[PDB]
Amino acid sequence: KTVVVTTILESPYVMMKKNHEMLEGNERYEGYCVDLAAEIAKHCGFKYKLTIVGDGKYGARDADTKIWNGMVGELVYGKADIAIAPLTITLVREEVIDFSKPFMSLGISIMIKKGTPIESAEDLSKQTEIAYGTLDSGSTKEFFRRSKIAVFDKMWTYMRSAEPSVFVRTTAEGVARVRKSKGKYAYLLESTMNEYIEQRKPCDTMKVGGNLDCKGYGIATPKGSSLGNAVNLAVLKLNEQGLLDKLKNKWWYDKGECG
Amino acid sequence: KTVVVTTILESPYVMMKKNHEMLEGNERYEGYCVDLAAEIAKHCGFKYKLTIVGDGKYGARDADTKIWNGMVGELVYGKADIAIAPLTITLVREEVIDFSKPFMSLGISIMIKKGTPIESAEDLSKQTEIAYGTLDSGSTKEFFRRSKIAVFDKMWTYMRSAEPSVFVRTTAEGVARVRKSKGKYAYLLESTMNEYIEQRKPCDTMKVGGNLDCKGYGIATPKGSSLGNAVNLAVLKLNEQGLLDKLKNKWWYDKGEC
Ligand SMILES: O=c1[nH]c2cc(C(F)(F)F)c(N3CCOCC3)cc2n(CP(=O)(O)O)c1=O
Ligand SMILES: O=c1[nH]c2cc(C(F)(F)F)c(N3CCOCC3)cc2n(CP(=O)(O)O)c1=O
């Protein structure tokens, strides 16, 4: 009764150890969610095997085929018993899977090259000298579109029609575009990923302002899992105990490069 | 067999009906959490008695006595089986009681008298001609103490050492102070209460800006309640079904006045 854990390769949640070819099983991996899985496993009392989600995806309905992909699909279709990953708690996913209480809280945020005279989304909306965009598809792009909040709809008005296109294909593209643009491009992305980059060499980016919305990552189990309650109580206790905060400090700041 | 529901009189969550002296039992009360209690009950299959928390409080641990007051205390000390109320999910409360998934999302927000040239917290930070404050003790002032976001810490720098005192003794004081100052005082309070007041006569306040943090209201049960699981699944399904949004629309906007 070894529990199959599905997860995803995304720094610093799960990463390959430098010498991973020499190692086997769970020892190939390290990261925030590697450590979290061990704590949850400990608290619930199960042995487990970490597996990387086959298709590299978090989980969406292939839009017109009704079939779930990513880690969600691995749970609904019985290929994994638990997902321990930065998986966003959403209502469409709650229709088919269960989430624990959030193990991390995050939201959309602004990344700038340090010295950029921007402090907030309002600041970006009021001005055109500094360009700004988001990933070229995903929740952050989707959030600005369907927002009705005036500051956010003005931002969508600007980004949708800007030329050259202010959207980027990957997080790495957005970040390179911030560092290369002399402080005249700003990037909208998840605060956790933003705080992670601000601790990476060459330490020239910074997160500014408060977050623009409220999301959480939760641990997911298939509906009717016998683990659901035990997992939820583990997260609650790990959160109360400060362990979640200690793991965040370890992988973001202890293992950081800019402190 | 009848479960005791503790809740609090807080408009529009639970309110006395116009003719409450004429009625008995659960029919004396009405509101968002009155209707929610009915849905939770329906979904979980229990009869229930609505009772108003004896001391009118939400729940805190007296530092000197270790004793909980309010609805939290009524759950932990066995006076109630469930709280169905706008009770904030917090880490100190989760140590002693269980919360369902949130049935409502809210945050700190800015209430303005209409016509005040303020649109955001940053705006308030850059200026002093318009004063601004919060309740004189509680989570919102507390959030400003420990903030490290630049705009929010500059605000706290200002508010702590301001004269006359920008803090107020009750929400009625803060709201009356917004209406009394023709737009030269701004009040920081929960987004839900802010949106509620903006739909009530005399329709002179409004919520401005986005929320400053992320909080949630949850249904609470004593630790080890057999209802904990049923309630959580009920809230999830009511949320999925849109009932929580419909109840918000009903008590905030359908029954609004502006
Ligand atoms: O559940 C989800 N969890 C996610 C977790 C992450 C992060 F932890 F930051 F890695 C990200 N990153 C966004 C930045 O580029 C790399 C991936 C995306 C996620 N998405 C897709 P989105 O919400 O459309 O962006 C989900 O759906
Ligand atoms: O659980 C809690 N739920 C609360 C719910 C509300 C309301 F908004 F009415 F629903 C309020 N306020 C009274 C109305 O005007 C401002 C907000 C306070 C609450 N508090 C104390 P706080 O956290 O110090 O603010 C709690 O502890």
Q: Taking CB atoms and an 8 Å limit, are A214 and B94 in contact across chains?
A: no
B203 interfaces chain A, CB cutoff of 8 Å: no
The whole-angstrom separation of Cα B110 and Cα B188 is 5
SS (H, E, C) chain B: CCEEEEECCECCCEEECCCHHHCCHHHHEECHHHHHHHHHHHHHCCCEEEEECCCCCCCCECCCCCCECHHHHHHHCCCCCEEEEEEECCHHHHCCEEECCCCEEECEEEEEECCCCCCCHHHHHCCCCCEEECECCCHHHHHHHCCCCHHHHHHHHHHHCCCCCCCECCHHHHHHHHHHCCCCEEEEEEHHHHHHHHCCCCCCEEEECCCCCCEEEEEEEECCCCCHHHHHHHHHHHHHCCHHHHHHHHHHHHCCCC
- In the numeric block, the tokens 């399904």 are attached to B237
Compute chain A's Rg from CA coordinates: 19
- In the numeric block, the tokens 């987004």 are attached to B191
Experimental technique, in short, is: X-ray
Pairing between strand B131-133 and A185-190? unpaired
Give the ligand 1 atom nearest the CA of A193: 9
Resolution in A: 2.0
3-class DSSP state of A111: strand
Pairing between strand B104-106 and B215-222? antiparallel
The whole-angstrom separation of Cα B177 and Cα B183 is 9
Enter the tokens of residue A242: 């400060």
Ramachandran region of residue B203, left (φ > 0), alpha (ψ -120 to 50) or beta? left
Would you list the domain boundaries of chain B?
1-106+216-255, 107-215
Q: Taking CB atoms and an 8 Å limit, are A120 and B212 in contact across chains?
A: no
Instruction: Flag whether A117 is marked binding.
Output: no
List b or e across A90-116, with b for residues whose CB sees 16 or more CB atoms inside 10 angstroms. beebbebbbbbbbbbebbbbbbbbeeb
Residue A72 Cα to ligand 2 middle (Å): 36
For residue A37, count other CB atoms closer than 10 A to its CB: 23
Contact pairs from chain A to chain B, CB under 8 Å:
42
Superfamily of domain A1-106+216-255: Periplasmic binding protein-like II (3.40.190.10)
Residue B12's contacts (CB-CB under 8 Å, 6 or more residues apart) are: B31, B32, B196, B251, B252, B255
| Smallest CA–CA distance from A99 into chain B, residue | B101
B172 interfaces chain A, CB cutoff of 8 Å: no
Name the residue facing A240 among B95, B105, B213 (closest C-beta): B95
Sign of CA dihedral B223, B227, B230, B232: negative
Q: Which residue minimizes the CA distance to atom 23 of ligand 2?
A: B139
The CA-atom distances, in angstroms, between B151 and each of A34, B125, B158 are: 36, 6, 11
For residue B122, count other CB atoms closer than 10 A to its CB: 21
Q: Is the CB of A136 under 6 A from ligand 1?
A: no
Contacts with A123 from chain B: Cβ below 8 Å: 122
For residue B129, count other CB atoms closer than 10 A to its CB: 6
Strand partners for B28: none
The whole-angstrom separation of Cα A51 and Cα A38 is 14
Strand partners for B50: B5
- Smallest CA-to-CA distance from B205 within B183, B226, B222 is with B183
The whole-angstrom separation of Cα B156 and Cα B207 is 20
B107 interfaces chain A, CB cutoff of 8 Å: yes
Answer for the pair B208, B112: CB distance below 8 angstroms, yes or no. Answer: yes
Beta-sheet strands, E only, within chain A = 3-7, 15-16, 29-30, 48-52, 82-88, 97-99, 104-106, 108-113, 131-133, 185-190, 205-208, 215-222
Contacts with B212 from chain A: Cβ below 8 Å: 210
Ligand 2 pocket: which residues have CB below 6 Å?
Answer: B 10, 58, 86-88, 138-139, 171, 189-190, 192-193
Strand partners for A17: none
- Smallest CA-to-CA distance from A111 within A49, A30, A44, A199 is with A199
Of A88, A96, A178, best ligand 1 pocket probe by most atoms within 8 Å of the beta carbon: A88
Do B1-106+216-255 and B107-215 come out as alike in CATH topology?
Answer: yes
Answer for the pair B74, B83: CB distance below 8 angstroms, yes or no. Answer: yes
Q: Which amino acid is at B214?
A: C
Using omega within 30 degrees of 0 as the cis cutoff, is the peptide bond preceding B12 cis?
A: yes
Superfamily of domain B107-215: Periplasmic binding protein-like II (3.40.190.10)
Name the residue facing A119 among B94, B122, B213 (closest C-beta): B122
